[PDB]
Amino acid sequence: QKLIANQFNSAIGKIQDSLSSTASALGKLQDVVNHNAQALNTLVKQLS
Amino acid sequence: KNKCVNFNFNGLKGTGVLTESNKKFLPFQQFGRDIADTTDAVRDPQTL
Ligand SMILES: *[C@@H]1O[C@H](CO)[C@@H](O[C@@H]2O[C@H](CO)[C@@H](O)[C@H](O)[C@H]2NC(C)=O)[C@H](O)[C@H]1NC(C)=O
């Protein structure tokens, strides 16, 4: 039980360091904002 | 100023609220625009 608990704590503690790196882990949630912002800026730029 | 006023600045008809600029204009600049092709700031022809 102690080995399973220690491995679970070591796997949970490496989640934050993995999400704090590689610069594209949360890119699937950045794409849905960067697509709406691009679709709005296209409507702004098509008035010129 | 500070009210919704129909303005006519050297033939430029429009409707908006005229507030203070608070941005450094260079002395050759008459108009002021945004991302779109709309006039955001006009230099005054009398009081400058
Ligand atoms: C239109 O009126 C404005 C406001 O009185 C004049 O602007 C000033 O004019 C005096 C004297 O002509 C100058 O000493 C100031 O330096 C001017 N101030 C600014 C901010 O320009 C303006 O000269 C008048 N227009 C004409 C063609 O005389």
Side-chain angles (χ1 to χ4, degrees):
Chain A
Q1 200 185 311
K2 289 179 70 175
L3 180 64
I4 289 165
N6 284 352
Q7 288 195 285
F8 187 79
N9 294 345
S10 311
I12 286 297
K14 287 191 282 212
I15 287 302
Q16 197 176 7
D17 300 332
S18 67
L19 292 169
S20 289
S21 172
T22 324
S24 165
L26 275 82
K28 192 181 288 185
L29 291 177
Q30 200 82 246
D31 281 332
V32 301
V33 192
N34 290 351
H35 281 198
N36 279 120
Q38 196 167 37
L40 284 180
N41 283 341
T42 315
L43 290 176
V44 173
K45 283 189 74 65
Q46 279 217 357
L47 283 170
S48 166
Chain B
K1 322 189 193 144
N2 310 82
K3 212 147 70 72
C4 186
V5 169
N6 298 118
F7 49 89
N8 202 304
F9 275 74
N10 305 268
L12 185 64
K13 298 181 185 292
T15 305
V17 171
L18 295 173
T19 77
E20 58 100 21
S21 78
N22 202 1
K23 45 185 178 180
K24 317 295 185 293
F25 274 17
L26 279 78
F28 68 96
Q29 280 156 339
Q30 170 65 248
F31 282 162
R33 281 181 177 174
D34 55 337
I35 296 98
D37 259 356
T38 56
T39 317
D40 202 85
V42 191
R43 196 186 278 275
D44 201 279
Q46 285 192 165
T47 178
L48 273 301

